[PDB]
Amino acid sequence: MVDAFLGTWKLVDSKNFDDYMKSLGVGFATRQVASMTKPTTIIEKNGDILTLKTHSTFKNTEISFKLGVEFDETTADDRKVKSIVTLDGGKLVHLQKWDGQETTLVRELIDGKLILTLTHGTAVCTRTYEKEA
Ligand SMILES: O=C(O)C(F)(F)C(F)(F)C(F)(F)C(F)(F)C(F)(F)C(F)(F)F
Ligand SMILES: O=C(O)C(F)(F)C(F)(F)C(F)(F)C(F)(F)C(F)(F)C(F)(F)F
């Protein structure tokens, strides 16, 4: 199921991330740092539990979850959300809900690259990761 997503991934392309951050209300000085950061994402499984780490020179996050089971999450920008991650069409779909708002973080594999599509409001950001050995 999820096994092609597992491993260490490095950011190699980003489109419309400023739009996405601004839609979420991230302040301009933070957006400026974030626009120049290249995170590493590490996706590990242990049985039915996935752990997704995001590491950078600015902020780090880590979440653990079972597919299809809601979990509490506090995002990098300090939103307290109700989250669920599911496999849908071969994509890892992460849905966050708070205050009646929603955002999706969708990961899919295309030609061995991991494409992360972030949608909030009308903003749609595409971030591409390449696998580390
Ligand atoms: O993993 C990535 O590339 C990523 F930086 F885009 C990201 F998903 F972490 C993210 F979008 F920045 C995020 F941290 F999750 C965020 F949505 F919470 C926000 F910070 F942008 F507000
Ligand atoms: O700090 C915010 O609000 C932020 F959105 F800018 C941010 F830290 F989440 C980030 F820089 F966008 C981020 F990209 F998610 C990150 F730094 F966490 C990382 F993913 F780069 F690691």
From Swiss-Prot:
Pfam families: Lipocalin (PF00061). Octadecanoate binds at R127, T128, Y129. Signal peptide: none annotated. GO terms for biological process: brown fat cell differentiation; cholesterol homeostasis; fatty acid metabolic process; intracellular lipid transport; long-chain fatty acid transport; negative regulation of cell population proliferation; phospholipid homeostasis; positive regulation of long-chain fatty acid import into cell. PROSITE patterns: FABP. (9Z)-octadecenoate binds at R127, T128, Y129. Keywords: Acetylation, Cytoplasm, Lipid-binding, Phosphoprotein, Transport. The keyword Protease does not apply. GO terms for molecular function: cytoskeletal protein binding; icosatetraenoic acid binding; long-chain fatty acid binding; long-chain fatty acid transmembrane transporter activity; oleic acid binding. Hexadecanoate binds at R127, T128, Y129. Its main location: cytoplasm. The modification Phosphoserine is found at S23, S83. InterPro entries: Calycin, Fatty_acid-bd, ILBP, Lipocln_cytosolic_FA-bd_dom. The modification Phosphothreonine is found at T8, T30. The keyword DNA damage does not apply. It comes from the Eukaryota. GO terms for cellular component: cytosol; extracellular exosome; extracellular space; nucleus; sarcoplasm. The modification Phosphotyrosine is found at Y20. It is found in: Cytoplasm. Belongs to the calycin superfamily. Fatty-acid binding protein (FABP) family. PANTHER family: FATTY ACID BINDING PROTEIN. Forms a beta-barrel structure that accommodates the hydrophobic ligand in its interior. FABPs are thought to play a role in the intracellular transport of long-chain fatty acids and their acyl-CoA esters. This is Fatty acid-binding protein, heart. It comes from Homo sapiens (Human). The lineage of its organism: Eukaryota, Metazoa, Chordata, Craniata, Vertebrata.
